[PDB]
Structure formats: C-alpha cells, structure tokens
Tab-separated table of N, CA and C in Angstrom:
chain	number	residue	atom	x	y	z
X	1	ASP	N	0.862	-1.224	0.000
X	1	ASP	CA	0.000	0.000	0.000
X	1	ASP	C	0.884	1.255	0.000
X	2	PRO	N	0.999	1.956	-1.128
X	2	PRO	CA	1.815	3.179	-1.151
X	2	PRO	C	1.116	4.383	-0.484
X	3	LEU	N	1.894	5.420	-0.173
X	3	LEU	CA	1.351	6.662	0.343
X	3	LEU	C	0.737	7.441	-0.834
X	4	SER	N	-0.496	7.070	-1.167
X	4	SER	CA	-1.187	7.596	-2.345
X	4	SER	C	-1.891	8.895	-2.038
X	5	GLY	N	-2.252	9.104	-0.783
X	5	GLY	CA	-2.816	10.364	-0.380
X	5	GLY	C	-1.716	11.336	-0.040
X	6	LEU	N	-2.089	12.402	0.636
X	6	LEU	CA	-1.139	13.440	0.965
X	6	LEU	C	-0.667	13.325	2.390
X	7	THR	N	0.641	13.452	2.565
X	7	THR	CA	1.231	13.601	3.893
X	7	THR	C	0.869	14.945	4.498
X	8	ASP	N	1.174	15.082	5.779
X	8	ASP	CA	0.888	16.315	6.481
X	8	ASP	C	1.695	17.446	5.833
X	9	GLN	N	2.942	17.202	5.470
X	9	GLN	CA	3.675	18.244	4.773
X	9	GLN	C	3.099	18.609	3.395
X	10	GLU	N	2.516	17.628	2.708
X	10	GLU	CA	1.933	17.859	1.388
X	10	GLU	C	0.658	18.683	1.492
X	11	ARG	N	-0.110	18.484	2.565
X	11	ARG	CA	-1.326	19.232	2.800
X	11	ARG	C	-0.965	20.682	3.071
X	12	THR	N	0.052	20.871	3.903
X	12	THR	CA	0.544	22.201	4.203
X	12	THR	C	1.097	22.862	2.945
X	13	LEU	N	1.842	22.093	2.179
X	13	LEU	CA	2.374	22.591	0.938
X	13	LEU	C	1.219	23.059	0.037
X	14	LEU	N	0.122	22.300	-0.015
X	14	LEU	CA	-1.012	22.687	-0.833
X	14	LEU	C	-1.548	24.028	-0.362
X	15	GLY	N	-1.704	24.175	0.950
X	15	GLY	CA	-2.249	25.392	1.510
X	15	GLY	C	-1.350	26.557	1.200
X	16	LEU	N	-0.046	26.367	1.283
X	16	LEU	CA	0.855	27.489	1.029
X	16	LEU	C	0.973	27.875	-0.451
X	17	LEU	N	0.854	26.891	-1.330
X	17	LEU	CA	0.762	27.132	-2.766
X	17	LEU	C	-0.438	27.975	-3.120
X	18	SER	N	-1.544	27.764	-2.416
X	18	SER	CA	-2.760	28.505	-2.691
X	18	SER	C	-2.666	29.980	-2.268
X	19	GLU	N	-1.672	30.318	-1.445
X	19	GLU	CA	-1.412	31.691	-1.058
X	19	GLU	C	-0.521	32.372	-2.072
X	20	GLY	N	-0.039	31.623	-3.065
X	20	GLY	CA	0.815	32.213	-4.078
X	20	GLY	C	2.268	32.341	-3.700
X	21	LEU	N	2.650	31.685	-2.608
X	21	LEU	CA	4.036	31.718	-2.197
X	21	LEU	C	4.919	30.977	-3.191
X	22	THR	N	6.108	31.520	-3.396
X	22	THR	CA	7.107	30.868	-4.223
X	22	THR	C	7.717	29.758	-3.381
X	23	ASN	N	8.543	28.943	-4.013
X	23	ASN	CA	9.260	27.879	-3.321
X	23	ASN	C	10.156	28.435	-2.222
X	24	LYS	N	10.736	29.615	-2.447
X	24	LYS	CA	11.661	30.170	-1.475
X	24	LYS	C	10.902	30.654	-0.244
X	25	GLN	N	9.746	31.231	-0.458
X	25	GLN	CA	8.917	31.692	0.642
X	25	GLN	C	8.370	30.530	1.469
X	26	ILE	N	8.004	29.451	0.774
X	26	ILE	CA	7.498	28.227	1.409
X	26	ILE	C	8.603	27.632	2.255
X	27	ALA	N	9.789	27.573	1.663
X	27	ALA	CA	10.943	26.998	2.336
X	27	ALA	C	11.236	27.782	3.613
X	28	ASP	N	11.029	29.087	3.559
X	28	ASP	CA	11.310	29.961	4.697
X	28	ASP	C	10.317	29.713	5.829
X	29	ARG	N	9.087	29.389	5.476
X	29	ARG	CA	8.087	29.026	6.487
X	29	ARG	C	8.186	27.581	7.025
X	30	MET	N	8.721	26.668	6.227
X	30	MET	CA	8.831	25.257	6.593
X	30	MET	C	10.202	24.878	7.132
X	31	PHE	N	11.085	25.865	7.216
X	31	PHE	CA	12.473	25.622	7.583
X	31	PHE	C	13.071	24.510	6.718
X	32	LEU	N	12.885	24.627	5.408
X	32	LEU	CA	13.498	23.693	4.479
X	32	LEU	C	14.400	24.440	3.503
X	33	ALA	N	15.208	23.711	2.737
X	33	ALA	CA	15.928	24.327	1.628
X	33	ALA	C	14.954	24.502	0.486
X	34	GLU	N	15.153	25.549	-0.300
X	34	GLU	CA	14.321	25.784	-1.446
X	34	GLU	C	14.309	24.580	-2.393
X	35	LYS	N	15.451	23.907	-2.561
X	35	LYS	CA	15.531	22.766	-3.497
X	35	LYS	C	14.644	21.603	-3.017
X	36	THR	N	14.540	21.421	-1.703
X	36	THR	CA	13.649	20.426	-1.129
X	36	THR	C	12.165	20.754	-1.441
X	37	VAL	N	11.781	22.002	-1.262
X	37	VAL	CA	10.418	22.416	-1.555
X	37	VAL	C	10.121	22.196	-3.027
X	38	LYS	N	11.043	22.589	-3.894
X	38	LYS	CA	10.884	22.346	-5.322
X	38	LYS	C	10.657	20.871	-5.627
X	39	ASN	N	11.410	20.010	-4.956
X	39	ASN	CA	11.281	18.587	-5.159
X	39	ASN	C	9.963	18.097	-4.606
X	40	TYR	N	9.528	18.649	-3.466
X	40	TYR	CA	8.272	18.245	-2.855
X	40	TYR	C	7.104	18.711	-3.742
X	41	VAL	N	7.216	19.868	-4.399
X	41	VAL	CA	6.125	20.346	-5.249
X	41	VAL	C	6.009	19.426	-6.472
X	42	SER	N	7.153	19.063	-7.030
X	42	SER	CA	7.170	18.148	-8.159
X	42	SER	C	6.479	16.820	-7.848
X	43	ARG	N	6.796	16.254	-6.693
X	43	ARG	CA	6.207	14.977	-6.259
X	43	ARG	C	4.711	15.101	-6.046
X	44	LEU	N	4.311	16.233	-5.477
X	44	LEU	CA	2.932	16.488	-5.134
X	44	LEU	C	2.099	16.587	-6.426
X	45	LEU	N	2.570	17.369	-7.394
X	45	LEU	CA	1.945	17.463	-8.704
X	45	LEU	C	1.846	16.094	-9.399
X	46	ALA	N	2.922	15.322	-9.361
X	46	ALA	CA	2.939	13.985	-9.959
X	46	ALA	C	1.876	13.091	-9.321
X	47	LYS	N	1.864	13.047	-8.000
X	47	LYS	CA	0.877	12.280	-7.251
X	47	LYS	C	-0.542	12.612	-7.716
X	48	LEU	N	-0.831	13.903	-7.813
X	48	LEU	CA	-2.157	14.381	-8.131
X	48	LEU	C	-2.488	14.338	-9.611
X	49	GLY	N	-1.518	14.030	-10.450
X	49	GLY	CA	-1.722	14.021	-11.889
X	49	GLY	C	-1.920	15.411	-12.466
X	50	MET	N	-1.129	16.372	-12.010
X	50	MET	CA	-1.207	17.718	-12.531
X	50	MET	C	0.172	18.158	-13.032
X	51	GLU	N	0.205	19.155	-13.905
X	51	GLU	CA	1.491	19.611	-14.465
X	51	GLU	C	1.939	20.963	-13.934
X	52	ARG	N	1.011	21.719	-13.363
X	52	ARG	CA	1.299	23.104	-13.045
X	52	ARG	C	0.796	23.505	-11.689
X	53	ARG	N	1.568	24.402	-11.091
X	53	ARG	CA	1.293	24.987	-9.809
X	53	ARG	C	-0.109	25.519	-9.669
X	54	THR	N	-0.580	26.194	-10.705
X	54	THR	CA	-1.895	26.784	-10.647
X	54	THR	C	-2.975	25.716	-10.488
X	55	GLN	N	-2.809	24.551	-11.115
X	55	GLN	CA	-3.777	23.467	-10.983
X	55	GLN	C	-3.846	22.991	-9.543
X	56	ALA	N	-2.690	22.843	-8.878
X	56	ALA	CA	-2.653	22.425	-7.494
X	56	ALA	C	-3.252	23.493	-6.631
X	57	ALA	N	-2.926	24.748	-6.923
X	57	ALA	CA	-3.550	25.817	-6.157
X	57	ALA	C	-5.078	25.839	-6.275
X	58	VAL	N	-5.608	25.574	-7.466
X	58	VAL	CA	-7.040	25.584	-7.652
X	58	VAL	C	-7.644	24.377	-6.944
X	59	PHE	N	-6.967	23.244	-7.010
X	59	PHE	CA	-7.456	22.073	-6.292
X	59	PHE	C	-7.487	22.291	-4.766
X	60	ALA	N	-6.469	22.929	-4.218
X	60	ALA	CA	-6.445	23.299	-2.793
X	60	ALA	C	-7.659	24.175	-2.416
X	61	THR	N	-7.929	25.174	-3.244
X	61	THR	CA	-9.022	26.114	-2.985
X	61	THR	C	-10.389	25.421	-2.933
X	62	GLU	N	-10.623	24.562	-3.915
X	62	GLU	CA	-11.878	23.845	-4.034
X	62	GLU	C	-12.027	22.882	-2.890
X	63	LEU	N	-10.904	22.308	-2.455
X	63	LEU	CA	-10.892	21.408	-1.307
X	63	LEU	C	-11.262	22.086	0.022
X	64	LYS	N	-10.723	23.281	0.263
X	64	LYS	CA	-11.014	24.046	1.478
X	64	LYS	C	-12.510	24.244	1.673
X	65	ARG	N	-13.245	24.425	0.587
X	65	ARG	CA	-14.674	24.687	0.699
X	65	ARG	C	-15.487	23.398	0.542
X	66	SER	N	-15.022	22.467	-0.285
X	66	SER	CA	-15.776	21.225	-0.517
X	66	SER	C	-15.689	20.274	0.678
X	67	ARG	N	-14.585	20.338	1.405
X	67	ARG	CA	-14.399	19.471	2.554
X	67	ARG	C	-13.479	20.152	3.569
X	68	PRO	N	-14.027	21.128	4.289
X	68	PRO	CA	-13.268	21.884	5.299
X	68	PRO	C	-12.755	21.007	6.446
X	69	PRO	N	-11.533	21.251	6.925
X	69	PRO	CA	-10.956	20.454	8.025
X	69	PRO	C	-11.753	20.495	9.346
F	1	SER	N	-19.229	50.863	-2.904
F	1	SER	CA	-19.631	50.198	-1.632
F	1	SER	C	-18.858	48.914	-1.395
F	2	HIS	N	-19.078	48.344	-0.213
F	2	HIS	CA	-18.588	47.011	0.146
F	2	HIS	C	-19.236	45.902	-0.698
F	3	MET	N	-20.410	46.184	-1.268
F	3	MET	CA	-21.157	45.197	-2.056
F	3	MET	C	-20.810	45.208	-3.544
F	4	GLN	N	-19.854	46.048	-3.934
F	4	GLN	CA	-19.514	46.203	-5.348
F	4	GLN	C	-18.818	44.951	-5.893
F	5	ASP	N	-19.161	44.596	-7.133
F	5	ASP	CA	-18.534	43.478	-7.836
F	5	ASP	C	-17.021	43.490	-7.624
F	6	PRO	N	-16.481	42.411	-7.074
F	6	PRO	CA	-15.024	42.289	-6.900
F	6	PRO	C	-14.254	42.386	-8.221
F	7	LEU	N	-14.932	42.170	-9.347
F	7	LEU	CA	-14.315	42.287	-10.658
F	7	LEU	C	-14.474	43.684	-11.256
F	8	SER	N	-15.034	44.602	-10.472
F	8	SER	CA	-15.199	45.972	-10.935
F	8	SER	C	-13.886	46.508	-11.507
F	9	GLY	N	-13.957	47.133	-12.673
F	9	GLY	CA	-12.761	47.731	-13.264
F	9	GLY	C	-11.995	46.827	-14.208
F	10	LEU	N	-12.334	45.546	-14.213
F	10	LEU	CA	-11.815	44.653	-15.240
F	10	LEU	C	-12.669	44.753	-16.505
F	11	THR	N	-12.038	44.658	-17.671
F	11	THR	CA	-12.758	44.527	-18.952
F	11	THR	C	-13.353	43.139	-19.102
F	12	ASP	N	-14.307	43.003	-20.015
F	12	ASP	CA	-14.900	41.689	-20.294
F	12	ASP	C	-13.838	40.649	-20.626
F	13	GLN	N	-12.855	41.056	-21.415
F	13	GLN	CA	-11.757	40.193	-21.784
F	13	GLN	C	-10.911	39.774	-20.575
F	14	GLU	N	-10.657	40.716	-19.663
F	14	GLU	CA	-9.897	40.410	-18.448
F	14	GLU	C	-10.701	39.461	-17.533
F	15	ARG	N	-12.001	39.625	-17.531
F	15	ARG	CA	-12.846	38.703	-16.758
F	15	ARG	C	-12.770	37.289	-17.331
F	16	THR	N	-12.888	37.181	-18.639
F	16	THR	CA	-12.747	35.879	-19.279
F	16	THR	C	-11.380	35.261	-19.008
F	17	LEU	N	-10.343	36.087	-19.083
F	17	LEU	CA	-8.980	35.638	-18.829
F	17	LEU	C	-8.831	35.064	-17.456
F	18	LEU	N	-9.286	35.837	-16.479
F	18	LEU	CA	-9.442	35.362	-15.135
F	18	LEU	C	-10.124	33.996	-15.031
F	19	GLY	N	-11.265	33.844	-15.670
F	19	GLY	CA	-11.999	32.589	-15.575
F	19	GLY	C	-11.252	31.397	-16.168
F	20	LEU	N	-10.471	31.654	-17.219
F	20	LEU	CA	-9.738	30.605	-17.901
F	20	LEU	C	-8.426	30.319	-17.178
F	21	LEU	N	-7.828	31.348	-16.595
F	21	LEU	CA	-6.718	31.150	-15.676
F	21	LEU	C	-7.061	30.162	-14.586
F	22	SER	N	-8.253	30.299	-14.023
F	22	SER	CA	-8.701	29.436	-12.939
F	22	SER	C	-9.019	27.998	-13.348
F	23	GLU	N	-9.066	27.725	-14.646
F	23	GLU	CA	-9.204	26.346	-15.119
F	23	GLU	C	-7.847	25.652	-15.229
F	24	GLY	N	-6.787	26.368	-14.866
F	24	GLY	CA	-5.469	25.784	-14.886
F	24	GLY	C	-4.811	25.821	-16.266
F	25	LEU	N	-5.349	26.590	-17.199
F	25	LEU	CA	-4.843	26.548	-18.569
F	25	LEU	C	-3.559	27.328	-18.767
F	26	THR	N	-2.763	26.918	-19.754
F	26	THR	CA	-1.619	27.711	-20.137
F	26	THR	C	-1.988	28.905	-20.976
F	27	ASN	N	-1.030	29.824	-21.098
F	27	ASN	CA	-1.181	30.963	-21.984
F	27	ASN	C	-1.550	30.473	-23.367
F	28	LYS	N	-0.909	29.410	-23.830
F	28	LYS	CA	-1.201	28.899	-25.189
F	28	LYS	C	-2.604	28.355	-25.256
F	29	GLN	N	-2.992	27.619	-24.234
F	29	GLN	CA	-4.352	27.095	-24.200
F	29	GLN	C	-5.377	28.217	-24.179
F	30	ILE	N	-5.151	29.213	-23.323
F	30	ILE	CA	-6.014	30.418	-23.293
F	30	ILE	C	-6.059	31.097	-24.640
F	31	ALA	N	-4.893	31.294	-25.264
F	31	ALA	CA	-4.829	31.954	-26.565
F	31	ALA	C	-5.695	31.234	-27.612
F	32	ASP	N	-5.561	29.907	-27.668
F	32	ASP	CA	-6.397	29.091	-28.534
F	32	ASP	C	-7.906	29.329	-28.302
F	33	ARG	N	-8.318	29.443	-27.049
F	33	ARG	CA	-9.739	29.622	-26.767
F	33	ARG	C	-10.238	31.059	-27.033
F	34	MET	N	-9.329	32.023	-26.932
F	34	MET	CA	-9.680	33.422	-27.067
F	34	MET	C	-9.392	33.977	-28.444
F	35	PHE	N	-8.846	33.145	-29.345
F	35	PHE	CA	-8.373	33.555	-30.663
F	35	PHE	C	-7.433	34.732	-30.514
F	36	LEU	N	-6.389	34.546	-29.715
F	36	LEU	CA	-5.384	35.577	-29.502
F	36	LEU	C	-4.048	34.915	-29.677
F	37	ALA	N	-3.017	35.706	-29.918
F	37	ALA	CA	-1.668	35.173	-29.949
F	37	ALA	C	-1.232	34.868	-28.507
F	38	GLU	N	-0.381	33.863	-28.312
F	38	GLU	CA	0.077	33.517	-26.992
F	38	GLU	C	0.792	34.693	-26.327
F	39	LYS	N	1.609	35.432	-27.082
F	39	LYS	CA	2.304	36.581	-26.510
F	39	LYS	C	1.300	37.623	-26.030
F	40	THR	N	0.194	37.796	-26.757
F	40	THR	CA	-0.843	38.731	-26.358
F	40	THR	C	-1.476	38.325	-25.015
F	41	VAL	N	-1.762	37.042	-24.854
F	41	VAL	CA	-2.304	36.556	-23.601
F	41	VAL	C	-1.286	36.797	-22.469
F	42	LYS	N	-0.014	36.522	-22.728
F	42	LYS	CA	1.034	36.740	-21.727
F	42	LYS	C	1.054	38.207	-21.260
F	43	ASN	N	1.056	39.147	-22.200
F	43	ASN	CA	0.861	40.561	-21.862
F	43	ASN	C	-0.432	40.845	-21.047
F	44	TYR	N	-1.569	40.305	-21.476
F	44	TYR	CA	-2.824	40.532	-20.783
F	44	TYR	C	-2.801	40.014	-19.364
F	45	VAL	N	-2.156	38.878	-19.148
F	45	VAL	CA	-2.068	38.296	-17.834
F	45	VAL	C	-1.294	39.230	-16.895
F	46	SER	N	-0.237	39.841	-17.389
F	46	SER	CA	0.546	40.775	-16.577
F	46	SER	C	-0.283	42.017	-16.264
F	47	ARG	N	-1.032	42.508	-17.253
F	47	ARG	CA	-1.869	43.671	-17.033
F	47	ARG	C	-2.980	43.340	-16.033
F	48	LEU	N	-3.562	42.146	-16.164
F	48	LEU	CA	-4.602	41.691	-15.270
F	48	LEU	C	-4.067	41.661	-13.863
F	49	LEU	N	-2.919	41.005	-13.692
F	49	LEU	CA	-2.321	40.873	-12.384
F	49	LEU	C	-2.017	42.247	-11.802
F	50	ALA	N	-1.457	43.143	-12.596
F	50	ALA	CA	-1.327	44.567	-12.172
F	50	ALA	C	-2.609	45.136	-11.618
F	51	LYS	N	-3.690	44.982	-12.363
F	51	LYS	CA	-4.986	45.455	-11.924
F	51	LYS	C	-5.460	44.830	-10.634
F	52	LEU	N	-5.178	43.550	-10.440
F	52	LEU	CA	-5.647	42.871	-9.247
F	52	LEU	C	-4.728	43.107	-8.052
F	53	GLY	N	-3.595	43.761	-8.259
F	53	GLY	CA	-2.662	43.986	-7.172
F	53	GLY	C	-1.959	42.698	-6.763
F	54	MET	N	-1.729	41.803	-7.716
F	54	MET	CA	-1.138	40.502	-7.419
F	54	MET	C	0.116	40.254	-8.223
F	55	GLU	N	0.985	39.384	-7.704
F	55	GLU	CA	2.258	39.119	-8.347
F	55	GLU	C	2.283	37.860	-9.155
F	56	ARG	N	1.417	36.913	-8.849
F	56	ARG	CA	1.549	35.629	-9.514
F	56	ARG	C	0.275	34.980	-9.990
F	57	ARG	N	0.428	34.245	-11.079
F	57	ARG	CA	-0.647	33.515	-11.728
F	57	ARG	C	-1.520	32.781	-10.727
F	58	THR	N	-0.894	32.088	-9.774
F	58	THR	CA	-1.618	31.268	-8.805
F	58	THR	C	-2.534	32.070	-7.966
F	59	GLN	N	-2.092	33.276	-7.608
F	59	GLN	CA	-2.920	34.144	-6.824
F	59	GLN	C	-4.191	34.520	-7.596
F	60	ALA	N	-4.081	34.761	-8.905
F	60	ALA	CA	-5.259	35.114	-9.717
F	60	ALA	C	-6.185	33.919	-9.826
F	61	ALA	N	-5.623	32.729	-10.000
F	61	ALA	CA	-6.444	31.549	-10.187
F	61	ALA	C	-7.209	31.235	-8.911
F	62	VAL	N	-6.562	31.426	-7.770
F	62	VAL	CA	-7.216	31.175	-6.492
F	62	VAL	C	-8.318	32.214	-6.236
F	63	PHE	N	-8.028	33.466	-6.525
F	63	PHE	CA	-9.015	34.522	-6.340
F	63	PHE	C	-10.265	34.249	-7.176
F	64	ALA	N	-10.074	33.805	-8.402
F	64	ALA	CA	-11.181	33.553	-9.296
F	64	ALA	C	-12.001	32.352	-8.866
F	65	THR	N	-11.326	31.324	-8.353
F	65	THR	CA	-11.968	30.105	-7.904
F	65	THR	C	-12.883	30.427	-6.733
F	66	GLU	N	-12.377	31.255	-5.830
F	66	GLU	CA	-13.135	31.753	-4.670
F	66	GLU	C	-14.376	32.489	-5.153
F	67	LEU	N	-14.208	33.315	-6.166
F	67	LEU	CA	-15.348	34.075	-6.657
F	67	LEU	C	-16.383	33.159	-7.274
F	68	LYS	N	-15.947	32.060	-7.880
F	68	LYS	CA	-16.869	31.180	-8.587
F	68	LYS	C	-17.896	30.599	-7.615
F	69	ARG	N	-17.493	30.371	-6.366
F	69	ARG	CA	-18.454	30.042	-5.308
F	69	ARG	C	-19.026	31.308	-4.661
C-alpha cells in the first residue's frame, strides 16, 4: 500500500501554494531548503496528476470549501 | 460600496482571462480559446495581475476560484 494520499507536509504545501508563495517563501516558512520544496512540489503534482502549480492551487481552494478540516 | 462586484474595473476580456486562468490553462491554451496570440495573452495576464494587485498567476487563479463560489 503506497502513500497515495497526501502527507501532512503535502497538505501544508497545498495550503501554502494557494497563497501564491514561491518555493523560497514556502521553504522559509517550513524551515526547508528551497531545493527540497521544489522537489516536494514536483512529487505532489505527480501524485495528483497535474502539471502546473496553478492546478494544485485551484485544487487546494476547491478542497477548502468542498471538505473543510 | 462594500457590495460592489469584486471584478469591478476589469474589462470583459480580463474577466474571461481570469476565468480561464482558474481552469489551470496555459497561456497557449487560453490563446487558442480566445483567438489571440500567446504573446498577447502573456501581456494581458501581466496587465490583469497589475490590476488585481497581485504578483503571480496562482494568486489570480485562487481569487477567481473563490469568486466562482
């Protein structure tokens, strides 16, 4: 059984992408290197079957309202 | 007023651009749908973002998604 859903960091990453933060800004909030965030965004997009940041951001937005935490 | 259309001051074309941005489309994809050159859409996106007081594509797509609900 692979980790097919989102980890806690991936959920946070989704939320921060929806604020329009760049990888460097995200990294600054997560205490990570920018290259790590870039790699995490790539994995997250791949998992979700999307190619672009904006798609993930739109999916995050729709999720916040369709199924609030 | 506080009740004024959040899209106030955008042209019809900028509103459409906004709506298509929020579908996750590329400049080329938008251009194809709007019968515009891709470079023209790229310029319009920058002007749109200027108008919205935003720096990045993702921010526009999220704002539009929010408005759609």
